[PDB]
């Protein structure tokens, strides 16, 4: 309650809603994903879980929803009421303040729309709120937007990290002072920790074919029990070539029903504010073409904080013995 | 507490990231390189104290400039890496890395010169200045050399184009997505401008609304400078706007100046938005809301850099200001 209240009012500031709507890959994907469901939303009722400024609710109205209930727990709900009023939709889009867990809707709804994903998919873990509203207020077999999330893992050779490690071998060319001996210290500092690092990679950093290691269907009942215990699964892949293996990037996509539109955070797709979630090994591990990497990745809430993402990594490079690493978000 | 702050600072400077930023800062590292090498005559065969040596790169520049002995004093765990950096370049006979605070180090001798890179954001936030002044009094010989010799503080009124774009962003949602969100503008201004925090951000010359005014100078060689630091480094200013724009507030930045010696022309390391970027960026002091001004609009007031009452290392800035015919206003800022 102390946490929930502190977590909600982190969204009472403009900067995080600005960043979300300024992410055009995200916002266009949601806009299209909603509008493309015009046939299934037309004449139907909708619950926007965590409506924020209310922009997703208004796309739902544009898709022909007859009513949208925009439920928002933080102070930003006042802005959304004015946005709705300003767009002339106060008769069809109803901003209700409070947590979706305890708000009273006038009715069960035909559809849920929500943008609930955090870093590494489940950090902040608003997903439990969405699934709570599904059970309580979505009608049987009702539409969820997006409908599902897919998790991906790929082994990586991070060019940024390389450049930072090799920075110390370059100081001589720049200023006449040799500093190559700092490299191992830079390695321990940048890789030896146990934090999930949130950073933008590109296709150049991907060391093998991405593997989908879990799918979460939002419409599947009892998925709330699974989240507390951890979701994820196993993977196996083979390296493209020779490079220092730095670890793994984890990312996700969300899929809207076809009416199929996919919002991807892959480093092979245009960048989003989510970037990717990097799991560095303690030190770089040389690999070559067809090196076999297998393992298991599990996304869990942290013991100390149920909204903080933790990731249990088990891996095995070639024949170098199975290792594990325990990661938590900063 | 102080033990909380000191442990957070040990841990920070014991980590590679902050040193990578300072050395990657080519404007800074190169100025110090030229500023030191330019003073070879003063430094040839003399002794040097490097206050806060970090990785030792400044102590090595000193040895490269002809110094016979350099004491490279560094309080964080990074002293161990600097010891290896000195050994790698074959300098451990001339450069001695000593761990710990400069306040408690014991040198074998007093020194001919002090070099230090001690400047925080807005010059004095997190400042190692008091460490440098303490080493000056205790270890520098009479008439010894200080590198850099001085710092100067500058203020300018600003129309921050990036801030403008964030303020107008909500007015541009409809053209992009069909949803009118221009009612958000007032709310965004309150968030982005209504706080009392100093914001550290890069600006360009396009942001500077009037001639930058130097309002203070710090001459490191002056004994009893220490008393001015606790009461306030500050000064008064007046300027006239270049043209029409919304006035968002003021930018504060600094330069430091190395003595000429061989060339007599003084090398300046600048953090002005008119000069190449550095990691110090600028300290922005936003008004509660934009104020429209035009060509030759008068702007005047007083700026005082102070320590915060709760934390002496945390920079506080008192801004008193007057825009044209508006009434004088004040706003009290602290670093986040
Ligand atoms: C100086 O600053 C820095 O340096 C900084 C550092 C960062 O690390 C920064 C990180 C950022 N990124 C970030 O924060 N999030 C990116 C993904 C987030 C995941 N959440 C999500 N999808 N958003 C929509 C959620 C909306 O639903 C509401 N809601 C929640 N539960 C509810 C419930 N039960 N009932 C009703 N309403 C509920 C919320 O109130 C909100 O309106 C941004 C800025 C950052 C800045
Ligand atoms: C037993 O020791 C502990 O447990 C300890 C105790 C402290 O109280 C600590 C206090 C710190 N605070 C601090 O650095 N604030 C500055 C922030 C902006 C300005 N920085 C800048 N422009 N360049 C930094 C250049 C290098 O100067 C070193 N240094 C700093 N002050 C020093 C001193 N008195 N003597 C010797 N070396 C000192 C740093 O470590 C750094 O590498 C850090 C670490 C500390 C460690």
Residue numbers in the entry:
A (entry chain B): 44 to 302, 307 to 377
B (entry chain A): 42 to 377
Quote the study's own text:
We also report crystal structures with various PRMTs supporting the observed specificity and selectivity. On the contrary, we were able to cocrystallize the compounds in the complex with both PRMT4 and PRMT6.
In all the structures of the complexes with PRMT6, the electron density for the compound is always better in one monomer. Moreover, for compound 12f, the active site of one monomer is occupied by both the compound and SAH. The crystal structure revealed an unusual distorted U-shaped conformation adopted by compound 12a (and probably also 12c and 12f) in the binding to PRMT6, with a folding at the level of the guanidine group. Whereas the adenosine moiety lies into its canonic binding pocket, the guanidine group of the compounds is unable to reach the PRMT6 double-E loop clamp because the linker with the sugar is too short, even for the longer compound 12f.
